[PDB]
Each structure stands twice: as C-alpha cells, then as structure tokens.
Amino acid sequence: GPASVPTTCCFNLANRKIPLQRLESYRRITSGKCPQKAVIFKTKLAKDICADPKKKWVQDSMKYLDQKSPTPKP
C-alpha cells in the first residue's frame, strides 16, 4: 500500500517542455518537507508532471499560469 498519498517531492524533473494549450493548471512546491523546491504541471488529460523552477518552459509556464490570474486582488 502507498504512504497515504503517492506524492512527496518532484525529484524526476521533466526535461521536455509542456505546451500551454494542453496545460490546465500547476502546483508549486515550497513546503518544509521536501529537500528542494519545485513545480508541478497539469495538462488537459487529468495527468500531472514534475517541473523545475529554473527551466525556460517552466518559467514561462509558471509565469503563464501566474499571469492568467486577475489584475486586482491577490
């Protein structure tokens, strides 16, 4: 059986770049459990992937999703 949930840290960072049209959302990591912070991307196929915050497609991806937010309020 799995330890509660089958997810802890994104050690297997994705090398390939994920598209925006196929992107659905993203989950950034910065808790006090993992050894290194990272990001997670979700496509339009009910699937999640790991991504590093020092990547070009990840940076644009994070900024893309982060930019998708509204102008006012936090």
Distance CA 70, CA 17 (A): 25
CATH (domain of 27): 2.40.50.40
> Which domain range does residue 43 map to?
1-74
Q: Which of 16, 36, 18 is nearest to 28 (CA)?
A: 36
Q: Which helix (H) or strand (E) element contains residue 64?
A: helix 56-68
Q: What is the domain count for the chain?
A: 1
Give CA–CA dist 3/73, Å, rounded.
37
Could you tell me which of 1, 3, 49, 2 has the C-alpha nearest to residue 22?
49
